[PDB]
Amino acid sequence: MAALAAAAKKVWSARRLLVLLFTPLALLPVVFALPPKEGRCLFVILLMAVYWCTEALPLSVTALLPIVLFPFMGILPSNKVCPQYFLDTNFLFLSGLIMASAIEEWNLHRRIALKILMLVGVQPARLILGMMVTTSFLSMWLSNTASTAMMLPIANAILKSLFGDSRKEDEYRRNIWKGFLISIPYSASIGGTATLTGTAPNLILLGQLKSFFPQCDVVNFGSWFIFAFPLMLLFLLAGWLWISFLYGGLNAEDRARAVIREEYQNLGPIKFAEQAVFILFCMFAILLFTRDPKFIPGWASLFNPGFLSDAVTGVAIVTILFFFPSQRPSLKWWFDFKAPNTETEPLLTWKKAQETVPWNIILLLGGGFAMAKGCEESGLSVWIGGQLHPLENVPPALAVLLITVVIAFFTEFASNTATIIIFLPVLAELAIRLRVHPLYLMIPGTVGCSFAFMLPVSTPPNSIAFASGHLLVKDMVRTGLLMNLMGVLLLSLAMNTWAQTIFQLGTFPDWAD
Amino acid sequence: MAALAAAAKKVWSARRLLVLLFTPLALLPVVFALPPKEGRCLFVILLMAVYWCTEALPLSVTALLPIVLFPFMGILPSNKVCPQYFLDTNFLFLSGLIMASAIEEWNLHRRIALKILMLVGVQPARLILGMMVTTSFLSMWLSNTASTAMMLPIANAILKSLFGDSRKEDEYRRNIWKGFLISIPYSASIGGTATLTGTAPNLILLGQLKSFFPQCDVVNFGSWFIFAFPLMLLFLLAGWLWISFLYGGLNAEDRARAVIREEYQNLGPIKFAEQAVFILFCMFAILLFTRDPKFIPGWASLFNPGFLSDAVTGVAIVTILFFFPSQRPSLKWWFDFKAPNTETEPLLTWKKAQETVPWNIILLLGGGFAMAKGCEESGLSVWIGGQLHPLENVPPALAVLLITVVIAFFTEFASNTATIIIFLPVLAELAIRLRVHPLYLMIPGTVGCSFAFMLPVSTPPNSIAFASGHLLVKDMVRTGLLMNLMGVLLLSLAMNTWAQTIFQLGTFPDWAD
């Protein structure tokens, strides 16, 4: 029956067009079953979810679907849905991306990575720790994909230098290779959750909060950092121990140290541009953290309340990158008339920034925000909350555990951003129905959607690591089961112990009722 | 006194930083003179105008200044100013840019250009006409910069083929060269005004109308086209006659025909992707035109009023480019099990679109819209209208003439988009003060800001043409004086004769009072 296999291959080869054409027909009964506006909004949301999961269209292109569907269906006029795509959360994201582009332009990230690798050591467990701490720190500010793609060649070079009764020794070599190659994407995913700009789903949560709960303002850069950074550190430590036990065995060292010092020296001396970019990045982080950390007064109290935000601070800081000189200025240049008068190069030109900023992710976040606005305005949120009646008796902690497990095992097959975009309105409505703080369910879902460790399709970093060829699918699956379990447990601990104090989750807020 | 010249050169070399640092100090008295909110808004507007004119910052970076300045100054909170950057006008612009990227990806624009050049002829006056008609048609959908940059090499090749008592013949050769090289940017600038998506200032007018006059909806793709296309044709004819008289003398022909047929044949046969892109472009134009042309009922009357717009149609049409196959589909492929199962290439991937869309111009338009919103909300518009009291006795036609002349002679030194962004609120307030329709002053300013012909700095197409080296500054100045005069006269004629019927300019609208 080779004809069946041939037909299956033909169907799989044209899977994108088939899914694209047949998803609206399959979702058509949703419109008929539900009330008109809510049914049409749910149809749009489900269509976009299926398109994102199956990759029938580019993620940015699928994110543009509200623009078409909401006005034709009467859910939302164009002049309303279109500006949801540049809410201030997207400007915070854009400022973070511009700062990351400036950092990568001058190889500051590589210098920091190599310095940390020098500091931690060369011993095998110490080396997996070094790699994990480097990737998690660089994923806090750069994207997970960029951090993984930059750190993988360094790991490959170090492993080649290290490895440049035979069955035993070869087994240990291969296990060390697999451990090094699997510790990078996991640490990138873990570290992306520590900051709002670290990964897109955090900004999805921030932007969709404005639509579902416009009066909520307790989630900002400082509060999210003080909540997630200890959780990120605990999860990174647990993952490092798990990987070192599983794979790491918990003159080669000299060779690895030599290759690390080669790659650090190849960067040359620290340029003035690198120092300026680092100082601007430190100012960026400090001013984002200290604007309104909610436990001590911030510098936003010196201005009009309700006017400033993290986006304004980010844009103001990244504006300096476009005019600050990349060469060391000197007052003698004015006095010396014989010096050349070539115009100085700024720290970042707009050409490089534009060619390095992922505008697709910006449009994806905008599509998520517009879908949240359409769900709120069409009344689909009220209908969803009405449908969540049988779950109103679930204990809140058990509810957190179940939603975290469901989102973690659903993000293993789809993009984290799309997963959180689809699942966040459900979490908000469930929290409203459960007489509990909306953040108490929304934050764990946002954090857990980034807990994608089992499959190459789960996150782009996983695919980049799998492209190396030293990792099997079974290896990532068996590591990711326990990674997901530890992440779920630690997320529940964080949500029940110190998120309560940070976000005032103990009482139902006035803006949620 | 060579020290003075040396110091002047030092100052000019560091002009960007000097302007950037000293403009706020020079504009500081504006805050003190005016009332607080209006003074701060005017300070922001003047700072952005100076930065745009002097190029102290990249245009997109300067467009981000409202994000910083309005919240710190209390003019507008971040959650309000940031979404002004993705009003639906920017999505119409983005759809136009994506369609232009799809057109340029498959060399459809080059095929159309070469076909038109074949059709018009090879005779010198006929050849300047051909060039002008090609560049003006391609500037209607592509950007002026892109059209000029694509059409200049073709003109260079044709001139080289043509030229590949000696003083007389050399004079005629040089004049023909100058005429061909000057007819391209002028025609690109003229043709950019025919459509809303042809050039950014039209979209600036459309977006700022939403802020100044939210209830105005008579300006759309169809109405703007039926207003500007006859005006564009008349101005193109006048410019062609002027250039042919000034420079064109109003076996070389065989050689030029041979090189044109070489460059047409080098494109190969018409691909299926080219045909699909052309059909999608025709659908794009027709559906934009027929949505609500205001003289015959459109297809928007079949849906909810006030929900659809040109942006929705544009996004819906350009969405097809991202999944429609670039190769001819066949039903035999399913039946033939031995055919390869390689996935088909879409007409446009998001990678190419992202690397070809000018996101800087999108951010510039957004900055213009945000500045318009800040001017309206801060009360600066009311103050400006109060300051325009002595001009209330000027006849409306004379007012149109004066504003067109002022804007035309001001855009000769700065970007058209920045010029229209700065001048449009003044035009709206002057129209309000003058008891006349706001469009009667706003449209001529928007059209005339694109009438930049005298200097290389006026428009990027002028700079690209000047980079060839065959054009002198005096040549462009002497051509552009009469080009500007004819443009002003034709714009006044259009505003006083047939714009009145198209836009109902004869009476003060209810949404303006």
Ligand SMILES: CC(C)CCC[C@@H](C)[C@H]1CC[C@H]2[C@@H]3CC=C4C[C@@H](O)CC[C@]4(C)[C@H]3CC[C@]12C
């Ligand atoms: C697109 C894929 C992956 C998901 C499944 C989509 C389709 C098959 C699903 C989604 C929602 C479903 C509908 C949900 C509710 C009802 C109401 C009742 O009359 C039972 C059938 C009916 C009408 C379902 C029919 C099947 C349905 C339309």
Ligand SMILES: CC(C)CCC[C@@H](C)[C@H]1CC[C@H]2[C@@H]3CC=C4C[C@@H](O)CC[C@]4(C)[C@H]3CC[C@]12C
């Ligand atoms: C500018 C940064 C990067 C480096 C300089 C030092 C930092 C730590 C300084 C600069 C400005 C300072 C703020 C200025 C004003 C206030 C308001 C006051 O009621 C509480 C302290 C607070 C909020 C300060 C905190 C510390 C602060 C943020």
Ligand SMILES: CC(C)CCC[C@@H](C)[C@H]1CC[C@H]2[C@@H]3CC=C4C[C@@H](O)CC[C@]4(C)[C@H]3CC[C@]12C
């Ligand atoms: C702050 C106010 C008062 C004065 C500003 C002076 C600025 C414009 C001056 C001071 C020092 C100068 C720099 C000194 C040296 C060089 C190296 C050479 O390649 C020329 C450009 C460059 C990079 C100069 C650019 C202009 C510069 C930055």
Ligand SMILES: CC(C)CCC[C@@H](C)[C@H]1CC[C@H]2[C@@H]3CC=C4C[C@@H](O)CC[C@]4(C)[C@H]3CC[C@]12C
């Ligand atoms: C990696 C593992 C071992 C660490 C996390 C352990 C988990 C299962 C533990 C640690 C902290 C615990 C929570 C601490 C406090 C409360 C509040 C109480 O009123 C109900 C139980 C609840 C909600 C606990 C649920 C279980 C919990 C989340």
Ligand SMILES: CC(C)CCC[C@@H](C)[C@H]1CC[C@H]2[C@@H]3CC=C4C[C@@H](O)CC[C@]4(C)[C@H]3CC[C@]12C
């Ligand atoms: C930046 C360059 C190109 C344009 C000129 C900017 C400066 C020099 C201009 C712009 C607006 C001007 C002010 C406009 C109005 C007044 C009120 C009155 O008291 C006269 C002086 C004063 C206070 C002017 C001082 C000079 C001023 C601040």
Ligand SMILES: CC(C)CCC[C@@H](C)[C@H]1CC[C@H]2[C@@H]3CC=C4C[C@@H](O)CC[C@]4(C)[C@H]3CC[C@]12C
């Ligand atoms: C789809 C396009 C590109 C090609 C097909 C032909 C075009 C010209 C057709 C397709 C749909 C048509 C529209 C369908 C419905 C209406 C409403 C009616 O009250 C007036 C005519 C009007 C507004 C039609 C005008 C012509 C139209 C736009």
Ligand SMILES: CC(C)CCC[C@@H](C)[C@H]1CC[C@H]2[C@@H]3CC=C4C[C@@H](O)CC[C@]4(C)[C@H]3CC[C@]12C
């Ligand atoms: C409309 C519904 C019912 C059926 C859709 C069938 C689609 C998916 C089929 C029909 C024709 C097919 C194409 C036929 C031939 C080729 C050339 C070869 O390189 C394989 C891919 C490609 C480009 C196929 C892609 C898939 C395709 C477009």
Ligand SMILES: CC(C)CCC[C@@H](C)[C@H]1CC[C@H]2[C@@H]3CC=C4C[C@@H](O)CC[C@]4(C)[C@H]3CC[C@]12C
């Ligand atoms: C290239 C040149 C020759 C063509 C344009 C000529 C200009 C100067 C002419 C042609 C049409 C004319 C307008 C036609 C109608 C009116 C309405 C009338 O109540 C006042 C004069 C006014 C407003 C005219 C002003 C001058 C005008 C704009």
Ligand SMILES: CCCCCCCCCCCCCC
């Ligand atoms: C090709 C991707 C978009 C498909 C949109 C289909 C919309 C169908 C709507 C059906 C329900 C409303 C009928 C009036």
Ligand SMILES: CCCCCCCCCCCCCC
């Ligand atoms: C009740 C008013 C709206 C009726 C039509 C709703 C469905 C419109 C679907 C349009 C699809 C357009 C795809 C490009």
Ligand SMILES: CCCCCCCCCCCCCC
């Ligand atoms: C030895 C290093 C000397 C130079 C240190 C300062 C580098 C540039 C810092 C720029 C900071 C800008 C803040 C707005």
Ligand SMILES: CCCCCCCCCCCCCC
């Ligand atoms: C570097 C570009 C931005 C400069 C902004 C300067 C703002 C100054 C405001 C002064 C008036 C208000 C004082 C309270």
Ligand SMILES: CCCCCCCCCCCCCC
């Ligand atoms: C009256 C309330 C506001 C007072 C301050 C206004 C000026 C603020 C200027 C901030 C400049 C920031 C540059 C990054």
Ligand SMILES: CCCCCCCCCCCCCC
């Ligand atoms: C000889 C040419 C045969 C093919 C003509 C059609 C090309 C593709 C047209 C696609 C139109 C899509 C409309 C949504």
Ligand SMILES: O=C(O)CCC(=O)C(=O)O
């Ligand atoms: O945004 C990132 O850091 C990349 C990872 C991500 O969000 C995804 O998997 O979609």
Ligand SMILES: O=C(O)CCC(=O)C(=O)O
């Ligand atoms: O948008 C264009 O077509 C380019 C020309 C323009 O707008 C400008 O000169 O700024």
